Amino acid sequence: MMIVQRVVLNSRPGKNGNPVAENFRMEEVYLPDNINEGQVQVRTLYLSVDPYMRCRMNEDTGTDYITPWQLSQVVDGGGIGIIEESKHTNLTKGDFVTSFYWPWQTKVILDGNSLEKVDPQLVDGHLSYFLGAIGMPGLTSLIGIQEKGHITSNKTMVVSGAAGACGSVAGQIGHFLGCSRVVGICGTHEKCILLTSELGFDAAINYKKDNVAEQLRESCPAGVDVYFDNVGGNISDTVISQMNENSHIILCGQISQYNKDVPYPPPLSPAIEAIQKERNITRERFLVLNYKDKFEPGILQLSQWFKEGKLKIKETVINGLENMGAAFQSMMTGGNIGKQIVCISEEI
Ligand SMILES: NC(=O)c1ccc[n+]([C@@H]2O[C@H](COP(=O)([O-])OP(=O)(O)OC[C@H]3O[C@@H](n4cnc5c(N)ncnc54)[C@H](OP(=O)(O)O)[C@@H]3O)[C@@H](O)[C@H]2O)c1
Ligand SMILES: CCCCC1C(=O)N(c2ccccc2)N(c2ccccc2)C1=O
Ligand SMILES: CCCCC1C(=O)N(c2ccccc2)N(c2ccccc2)C1=O
Ligand SMILES: CCCCC1C(=O)N(c2ccccc2)N(c2ccccc2)C1=O
């Protein structure tokens, strides 16, 4: 048997704690030499890190559709790989495949029925895009905007988490689908420049260093019609206060709250909820997995926009399975521009 590397959950940060690289531990394990009928042996190429993973580090995730990671057991998440051996009738050696529950391990034996075969032509061979802009975050942005944005209209969109995986795509799609103005809120001036100089955002606001309320008044002079919310907390309170009658909050995530012992989705404060109700602002829970029937058209559209040169795809790649923990910590504290990716093998 050959020896491979895996990542297991080492320790929990606590419900109110910050996640750190040391919450994960690398181990070496044997990979069995044979696979059974219906299984495939896959070489892991890229793995995702994602904000939802924070709740998987707690003993109770607080959400009925996410299971907690278990101490000393292999971690899992979005991944893409290449089939090395197959005893599944619909998969063969050399196929590229994806799973939402890919073990954090360099080579894996999986049930073939749990994988989706993907076409590398859709990403011009850049496979890591299947974990970002031509993957779940891209789909979340496109389907979120389509289903919850009510964009036809010379509307103004605000995007929080604007320079992240979802946000960087959302702001571009807002322009593609008819917003006249798209304004981004993010955590660094470097990110602000990216948004306006490369991604076509009309304005960018650094929430750490800028006065968010007054910058939104200057950059959104006609108020806010659509809010693509990745962050929640005080930032969302500030945006909501400038939202128009009959506007829409695309409630994508609330990452400002993930290191706190509070339920998801978190309620708005009494003052901000009052504004929401008075202005008839809609704020419905959005779960991209409720729209799996739209993933095909979504991916095909994201791909087409990419290939046309319209959709600009940004990512931050760290190399090596040993860096999964560091990549997660980095993403959670804003180290990533666009999608955080970990490259697990050589790009061939
Ligand atoms: N509803 C769904 O089906 C669905 C699907 C996918 C993702 N989501 C949600 O979408 C959001 C974005 O996920 P992603 O994968 O695109 O991650 P991401 O935006 O690429 O990475 C997270 C970013 O969050 C920002 N951040 C971290 N802590 C913050 C804080 N306290 N306040 C403000 N910003 C903070 C950081 O950028 P800064 O430098 O700008 O702080 C960091 O780069 C998350 O809330 C996630 O749960 C939802
Ligand atoms: C409690 C986290 C809040 C937003 C959250 C969500 O419900 N999903 C989410 C939806 C269904 C199953 C699992 C998570 N994911 C998510 C992350 C990456 C890709 C897709 C969805 C999210 O980040
Ligand atoms: C997308 C890859 C497979 C994920 C699959 C799943 O595990 N959950 C899921 C997780 C736990 C319990 C039930 C389903 N749901 C799901 C569907 C809609 C909304 C939320 C989750 C899914 O679609
Ligand atoms: C949450 C994942 C559950 C399976 C899921 C998948 O990963 N892809 C999928 C593959 C690559 C990127 C994003 C999703 N698609 C999918 C996409 C387009 C057409 C058919 C299927 C899927 O339905």
From Swiss-Prot:
NADP(+) binds at residues 164-167, 191, 207, 230, 252-258, 286-288, 336. Functions as 15-oxo-prostaglandin 13-reductase and acts on 15-keto-PGE1, 15-keto-PGE2, 15-keto-PGE1-alpha and 15-keto-PGE2-alpha with highest activity towards 15-keto-PGE2. Overexpression represses transcriptional activity of PPARG and inhibits adipocyte differentiation. Its EC number is 1.3.1.48. Its main location: cytoplasm. Changing residue 258 to F: Increases affinity for 15-keto-PGE2. Reduces affinity for NADP and Vmax. It is found in: Cytoplasm. The gene is PTGR2. It comes from the Eukaryota. Belongs to the NADP-dependent oxidoreductase L4BD family. One of its GO terms (biological process) is prostaglandin metabolic process. Substrate binds at residues 100-101, 287-289. InterPro entries: ADH-like_C, ADH_N_2, GroES-like_sf, MDR_fam, NAD(P)-bd_dom_sf, PTGR2. One of its GO terms (cellular component) is cytoplasm. Pfam families: ADH_N_2, ADH_zinc_N. Keywords: Cytoplasm, Lipid metabolism, NADP, Oxidoreductase. It catalyses: 13,14-dihydro-15-oxo-prostaglandin E2 + NAD(+) = 15-oxoprostaglandin E2 + NADH + H(+); 13,14-dihydro-15-oxo-prostaglandin E2 + NADP(+) = 15-oxoprostaglandin E2 + NADPH + H(+); 13,14-dihydro-15-oxo-PGF2alpha + NADP(+) = 15-oxoprostaglandin F2alpha + NADPH + H(+); 13,14-dihydro-15-oxo-prostaglandin E1 + NADP(+) = 15-oxoprostaglandin E1 + NADPH + H(+). This is Prostaglandin reductase 2. The keyword Lipid metabolism applies. Monomer. Gene3D superfamilies: Medium-chain alcohol dehydrogenases, catalytic domain, NAD(P)-binding Rossmann-like Domain. Widely expressed. One of its GO terms (molecular function) is 15-oxoprostaglandin 13-oxidase [NAD(P)+] activity. Changing residue 65 to F: Increases affinity for 15-keto-PGE2. Reduces affinity for NADP and Vmax. Transmembrane segments: none annotated.
